[PDB]
Amino acid sequence: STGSATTTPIDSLDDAYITPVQIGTPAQTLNLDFDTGSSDLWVFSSETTASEVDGQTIYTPSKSTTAKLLSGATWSISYGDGSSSSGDVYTDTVSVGGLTVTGQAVESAKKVSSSFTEDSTIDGLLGLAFSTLNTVSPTQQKTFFDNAKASLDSPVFTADLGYHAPGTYNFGFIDTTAYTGSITYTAVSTKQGFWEWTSTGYAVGSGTFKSTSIDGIADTGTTLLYLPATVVSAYWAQVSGAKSSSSVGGYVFPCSATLPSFTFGVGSARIVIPGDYIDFGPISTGSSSCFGGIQSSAGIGINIFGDVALKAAFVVFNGATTPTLGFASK
Fold it and tell me: Which of the residues 39, 95, 199, 297 is marked catalytic?
């Protein structure tokens, strides 16, 4: 089997991407944030504290003839950005782009943090990291991909995120029309539960390539590109007037700037992030100071190849017995 679904930016900055997901019988369609950095499929629901729901579409398990309470199971998750959610668990039928999993754990939120409430466009998350990170207790549950994998034509999914435009998540096949050149595959460590890999270096604009190993994670659920402070300083030094602002929370730059591109290495291959992908717009409405899309990972504890990087590529998440990651230009 295969599946194919369009993923759409939630706003004009590509702050996140939402993908429609069918849950239950009859189907209830929720728009979920596909997150290769976590491993829980959780949704706003009829159980979510009413004051914490503000415009989201909810899953109502009592209206699904295939929903079953997973007795005694609870979940609770905290994300790198400080947000969190928790609740109880159902199993139900879940379909993405025509690919169906029966008995998928659907984690129903009883509580969500303010950041989730305040984002009316995201109805929940669909985790695509390794199932070892799943938070369900006392019996850990599998991700949608892990459940689907054996049925897929090939044990893979691909992320093809758009810049200020829709893109695609495919399951079970590689669309050879969706990229240019070849896909370069690179090793993955699953030791921390992530799609963790090592970039071979970087360049800023038309500058020379610096060969240096950068360990990090391919994370569709993180907006920006978080890299070591040395790398980030080298990038922003090429933008007149750019500075790191402790008050704002990172590098800012004059909105009048033309940003240089940023290249990262995948083996001997190179992925070029155009400068415009690194512009996250005014820090506050009407400001002429703009927020940068490349930020320091110092004090995160891990480098993160978030959407800024991934949307410059066609990315293969290869879930073979020994997982790997593939990157192609597009």
Answer: 199
